[PDB]
Amino acid sequence: NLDDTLDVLNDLLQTSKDGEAGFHACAEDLRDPQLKAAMLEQSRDCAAAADELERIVLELGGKPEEAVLNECERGEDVAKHRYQAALEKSLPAEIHQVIERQYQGVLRHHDRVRALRDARA
Question: Which residue pairs form cystines in this protein (predicted)?
């Protein structure tokens, strides 16, 4: 039980961290200033996601340019999928709420970059 819970928390933590680094790099590699700012806000929000998912992991006992757009958007979709799978599992009420709320953030950012890619089409 607590094992599977921790197993999920852990997966999402590594996810947040990957995206903190990765979305910052995507941000350094974009000449377009609207798309930089979006990769940077997502970077920052993964960082927050990570801090929140690490408190709860420690609390519970655990130990923790087109081409450029294509890979970064890949990275966002990987985030979304990991959160969807995580929301499938049955988990303490409290923990579900956190992941749900983080999920809303994940979607808003992808919705943004996808919107921005459309305006350049």
Answer: 26-72
**Best CATH choice for the domain 1-121 from the list 2.30.29.30, 1.20.1090.10, 2.60.120.260, 1.20.1260.10:** 1.20.1260.10
Residue 118 burial (C-beta neighbours within 10 Å; 0-12, 13-18, 19+):
exposed
Structure determination method: X-ray
**Residue 105 in contact with residue 89, Cβ under 8 Å?**
no
Give the contacts of 111 (CB within 8 A, at least 6 positions apart). Answer: none
Residue with tokens 């990991």: 82
Cβ(23)–Cβ(72) below 8 Å: yes
In our burial notation (b when 16+ CB lie closer than 10 A, e otherwise), range 26-46 reads bbeebeeeebeebbbbbbebb
Contact 90, 5 (CB under 8 A): no
Q: Is 61 left (phi over 0), alpha (psi -120 to 50) or beta?
A: left
Yes or no: say if 13 and 50 are a contact pair by the CB < 8 Å rule. yes
